[PDB]
Amino acid sequence: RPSRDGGCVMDVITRRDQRGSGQVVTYALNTLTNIKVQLIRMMEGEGVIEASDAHNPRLLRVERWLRDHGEERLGRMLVSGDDCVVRPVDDRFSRALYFLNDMAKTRKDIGEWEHSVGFSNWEEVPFCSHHFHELVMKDGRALIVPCRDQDELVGRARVSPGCGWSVRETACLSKAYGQMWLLSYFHRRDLRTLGLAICSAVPIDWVPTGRTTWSIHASGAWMTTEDMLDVWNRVWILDNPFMHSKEKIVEWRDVPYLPKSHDMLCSLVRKERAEWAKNIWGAVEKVRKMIGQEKFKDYLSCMD
């Protein structure tokens, strides 16, 4: 806390509830007990419990439900920490807000007693800051790729941990971003371009550094100096348990793209993303000049 003397004082305070975000087990504890919130909220919408149960709890009714239904209901939902996706047994779940509210788990951006709003289309459901779309490749095999707003994706890359920072270190960080985009957002035209361009502007010997995301689902697989296609085939095909046929893909030209309209309707492929993409080689060249006398390869040209 800032002091009234031109400096800074450090307060020592205590309290009982809430979670320290840094605890070694925040993710697991916030995960387990959010499983429990949603298991409960399912129960209310299903008729297992009512508001009456806040006072007189009908425990054998909930014990019966766990016994006859627990393992089934557990598979109806995806729970990562404090984020979930629930597929309840019917749409009564949208009004089940007692207990959700009594347990203090207020819903963001909605009236306390206002019905929740659901999605019929799995591709429109948000999870872990992403939507997920299904892509078919040229060889008929299908992928389900994660998607996120381009501008939010780039904006985080376009910001730096601080000054006193070298040109080599700021290059290395940019590699990590670009190489990650190549793993997970290759299906976006602009990101594919910008990712390859970064990879073309940064030395091939320079190992990436830094954190590109905090997600507990980031493979981390991109902070290598292996061929990015080589890792792409590994994670999307060889080690993908959902991939029956493991024929490797030979060139970026074969890795698919979102349907054009989803790309433009998900934040630039616009008059200005023609000038940009046309003259992006100029940009790479500038960056290589800043970096100086190192070993660059040209990955943008394997895009034609």
Partner 1 sequence: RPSRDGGCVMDVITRRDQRGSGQVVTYALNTLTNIKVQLIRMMEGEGVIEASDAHNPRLLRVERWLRDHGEERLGRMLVSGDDCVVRPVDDRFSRALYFLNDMAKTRKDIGEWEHSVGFSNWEEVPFCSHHFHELVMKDGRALIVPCRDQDELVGRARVSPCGWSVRETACLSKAYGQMWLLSYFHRRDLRTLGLAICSAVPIDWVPTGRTTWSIHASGAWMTTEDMLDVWNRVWILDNPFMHSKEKIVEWRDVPYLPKSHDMLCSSLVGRKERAEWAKNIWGAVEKVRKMIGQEKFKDYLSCMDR
Q: Which spans of this chain sit near Zn ion (rule: CB under 5 A)?
A: 131, 147, 266
Please report whether residue 205 would count as binding partner 1 according to CB under 8 A.
Answer: no
Instruction: Find out whether 217 is annotated in a ligand binding site.
Output: no
Determine how many CB atoms are found less than 10 A away from the CB of residue 81. Answer: 15
Please report whether residue 209 would count as binding partner 1 according to CB under 8 A.
Answer: no
Residue number closest to Zn ion, CB atom: 147
- Residue 44's nearest CA partner among 122, 99, 6 is 99
For residue 255, what are its two tokens? 């890795």
Please report whether residue 295 would count as binding partner 1 according to CB under 8 A.
Answer: yes
Cα 32 versus chain centre, distance? 20
Closest CB 93 distance from Zn ion, rounded Å? 26
Radius of gyration of the chain (CA): 24
Residue 114 to residue 94: CA distance in whole angstroms: 9
Instruction: Find out whether 163 is annotated in a ligand binding site.
Output: no
- Which partner from the list partner 1, Zn ion, none does 291 bind, CB cut-off 5 to 8 Å by kind? none
- Which partner from the list Zn ion, partner 1, none does 138 bind, CB cut-off 5 to 8 Å by kind? none
Closest CB 248 distance from partner 1, rounded Å? 6
Interaction pattern, residues 234-253, with partner 1; x per rule: CB under 8 A: -------------xx-xx--
- Residue 95's nearest CA partner among 61, 48, 51, 44 is 44
Strand pairing category for 77-80 and 83-86: antiparallel
Identify the sign of the CA torsion 162, 163, 168, 171: positive
Instruction: Find out whether 147 is annotated in a ligand binding site.
Output: yes
Closest CB 288 distance from partner 1, rounded Å? 7
Q: Which is nearer to partner 1, 88 or 195 (CB)?
A: 195
Cα 290 versus chain centre, distance? 32
Please report whether residue 67 would count as binding partner 1 according to CB under 8 A.
Answer: no
Please report whether residue 302 would count as binding partner 1 according to CB under 8 A.
Answer: yes
Q: Which is nearer to partner 1, 134 or 298 (CB)?
A: 298
For residue 124, what are its two tokens? 């429109």
Instruction: Find out whether 83 is annotated in a ligand binding site.
Output: yes
For residue 178, what are its two tokens? 């670009």
For residue 268, what are its two tokens? 């630039």
Residue 293 to residue 22: CA distance in whole angstroms: 42
Q: What are the backbone angles phi and psi of residue 135, rounded to the nearest 5°? A: -115, 130
Site for partner 1 in 261-290 (CB under 8 A): 288
The stretch among 12-20, 44-52, 68-76, 295-303 that binds partner 1 (CB under 8 A) is 295-303
Residue 37 to residue 103: CA distance in whole angstroms: 8
Instruction: Find out whether 128 is annotated in a ligand binding site.
Output: no
Q: Which is nearer to partner 1, 80 or 224 (CB)?
A: 224
Contact residues for 288 (Cβ-Cβ < 8 A; gap 6+):
201, 294, 296
**Helix count and strand count (H, E) for the chain:** 9, 4
- The size of the interface with partner 1 (CB under 8 A), counted in residues, is 13
Q: Which is nearer to Zn ion, 175 or 189 (CB)?
A: 189
Which residues belong to the annotated binding site for Mg(2+)? 83
Q: Provide the binding-site residues for partner 1, judged by CB under 8 A.
A: 230, 247-248, 250-251, 288, 293, 295-296, 298, 301-302, 304
Which residues belong to the annotated binding site for Zn(2+)? 131, 133, 147, 266
Which residues belong to the annotated binding site? 83, 131, 133, 147, 266
